[PDB]
Design a protein around this nucleic acid. Sequence first.
DNA 1: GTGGATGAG
DNA 2: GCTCATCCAC
Length: 511
Amino acid sequence: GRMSKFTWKELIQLGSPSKAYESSLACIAHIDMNAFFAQVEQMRCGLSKEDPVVCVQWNSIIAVSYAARKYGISRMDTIQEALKKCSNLIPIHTAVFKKGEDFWQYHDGCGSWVQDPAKQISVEDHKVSLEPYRRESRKALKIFKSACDLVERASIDEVFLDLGRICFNMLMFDNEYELTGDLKLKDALSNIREAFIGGNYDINSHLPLIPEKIKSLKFEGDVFNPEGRDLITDWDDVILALGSQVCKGIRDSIKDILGYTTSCGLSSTKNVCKLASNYKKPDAQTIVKNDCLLDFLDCGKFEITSFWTLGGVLGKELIDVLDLPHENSIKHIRETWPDNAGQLKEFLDAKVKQSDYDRSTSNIDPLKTADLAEKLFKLSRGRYGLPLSSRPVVKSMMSNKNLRGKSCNSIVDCISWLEVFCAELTSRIQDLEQEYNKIVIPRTVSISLKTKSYEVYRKSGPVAYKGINFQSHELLKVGIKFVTDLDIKGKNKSYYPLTKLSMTITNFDII
DNA sequence: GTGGATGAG
DNA sequence: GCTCATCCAC
Ligand SMILES: [Ca+2]
Ligand SMILES: [Ca+2]
Ligand SMILES: [Ca+2]
Ligand SMILES: [Ca+2]
C-alpha cells in the first residue's frame, strides 16, 4: 500500500509503560518454566534435562519432566505406576518439615518407592515445604526484572513481559544490531529514524511504509505461519521480530545463570501470548503475527474454554448459554456477532432474560454484561489486550496439616505442629518482603482445627511485637495460647484425635 | 464470620 | 488429585 496501517501515535505509545499494552503494535511475551518443580530438583541434584526426573510428594507425582513423559508418565500416575513405565525413573521427594522442628530438609534417597524401611518419609509426621521452589522463582523474577521494566508475575513459574520500550528503543536508537555482514538497522531503518527525530509528523498520521532492507530481519523462534504468509509486511512485524531476539537473550540468561528451560509466547496480547507459550514445550518460542491471529486461534487446538478466565465453570456456562458448538467455538463467536460487541450484548441480555436461566448461581454479572461481550468479541479475534498488572497485596496466608491416624492426641502434639506452621509462615513473609521490598508484619493470628468428628473450632486475635519488627516467636506464643484455649473448650466433647490443624495470619501492615 | 466455590492443569 | 488465596451468599 502507500502508507503503513499504523499511526505514529500507536508506535510512540510503545514507549510508555502504562499505555504500551493498548497499542495494536504491542509486543508482549509470556514465559513459562515448564515442569518447574522437576527442573528445580534436577538442578539441585546435579542431573541433566534429559534425565527422567519426577518430583514427588508422598505417593503422588506433582511435577513430571519432559524426559519422563517420553515414557507415558503423567501426573495422573502414582510413583509405583510410573515405575512400571520407566524403571530408571528418578523420583525425588520434596523437602519436608518434621512435626516439632522449625526447619525443612531434603531426605534424598528416601521415599515410598524405596524398599528399605529405614529410608522412608512418613506422611504422618511430616509436612511438605515448597520453599525451594519459591526461592528459585524469586531468582528468576529478579533476572526478568533486570531485563525488562514491566514484568507481571503470573504465577510461581510464569511471567508476562511488555517489551515495548526495549523494542521501540531498538527500532529507533540501536546502532549496533546487524541483519547481515554489511547491513545494520541504523542504515536499513534510516528513514523511520530520521522522520522520528525530525518531529515533523502529526501523531495521527500513518507511518511510512517499511523499507525493503528490513524484510531480511530474522525472527527468532518458530513463527506460526500455516498459510505461508510473508514474515515482514508492516511495523507490527518489525517490532515482533525485534521482540523475539530480545526475548531469546532473556531466556538464555535464565538458562545460563540458573539452568532452567522455558517456553515462550510472543504476540500483541497477553491471552494470545499464553496460548503460544503452551503451544510447544519445552525450550521453545512461538511467535504469533497479527495477520496470523485467526490462523492461530482456528488451528483446531483451542476453544473459548482455552482462555485464561474461561478454563472452568464460567467457561461451561458460556458454551451452554451461548449455544456454541463443542468445536470451533471461537470462530463460531466471530461469525455470529461479526460487526460489533453490542450484538453479543443484546443476545446475552435476551438469554440473560429467560425462565430456564438462573440468576442465583449464574457466574454472569447482569450489570456487567457490557464488558463481557467486548471481552469475548475481542478475545475471539485475538485483540483483547489487558495491562500487565502487579498482583494485589496478600490478605491472608495459611499453613495447615491434614492429620490422619492419632498423631494429634494432645496439646503437646498440636504445639509441635504449630512450630512447623510458624517456621513456614515466617519464610513466606520473607518471600513477600523481597517481592514488595517492604516490611510485612501481620497483626492477627487465627488457629483452626477439626476434631475427630470433623467439627470446626477457631480462635482469632492480635499478635503483639515487643519490637517494631516481626518475630516468629511472638506468632508461636499466641498460637500456643489459642491452641490451649481450644483444648479447654473441647473438654468433654468430640475432640481428639484431631483430623486437621491450621494457622492463618491476616491484617498485615505493609509499612 | 466463613464454608464452600473458584481459578490453573 | 491436589494446592492455596480470595470472594461472598448464607
Ligand atoms: Ca505452567
Ligand atoms: Ca521442638
Ligand atoms: Ca503452573
Ligand atoms: Ca498487515
